[PDB]
């Protein structure tokens, strides 16, 4: 499901923080950058020009790339849910609210 995609995105973000410009091994940062990226994605979900400040250039670039990947996955899940909307194929009760919110 989408949980596996989210976990893969989080693992990719961790790998990027470890390898994509880690600023050298000098007791580097932690998942607080992941929290900043998640907050930036939530802000973009509001269609606002907010972003994830307080970080270097490649960190922000990787954050934007991961956010675009997660948003593409969400749009694809929404398209798959809307495809099974007219017919439905006996959709469950919880998926309906999620698809409706995404749309």
């Amino acid at each position: 499901v989408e949980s596996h995609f989210d976990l893969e995105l989080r693992a990719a973000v961790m790998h990027d923080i470890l390898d994509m410009m880690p600023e050298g091994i000098k007791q580097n940062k932690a998942r607080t950058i992941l929290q900043h990226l998640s907050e930036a994605w939530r802000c973009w979900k509001a269609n606002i020009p907010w972003k994830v400040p307080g970080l270097p250039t490649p960190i922000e670039n990787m954050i934007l790339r991961y956010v675009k990947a997660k948003a593409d996955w969400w749009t694809n899940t929404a398209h798959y849910n809307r495809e099974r909307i007219r017919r439905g194929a006996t959709v469950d009760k919880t998926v309906c609210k999620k698809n409706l919110g995404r749309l």
Binding site: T75, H79, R82, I85, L103
Partner: peptide
């Protein structure tokens, strides 16, 4: 993508 989706939904 968004145009055809919002048009047919």
């Amino acid at each position: 993508e968004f145009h055809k989706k919002f048009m047919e939904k």
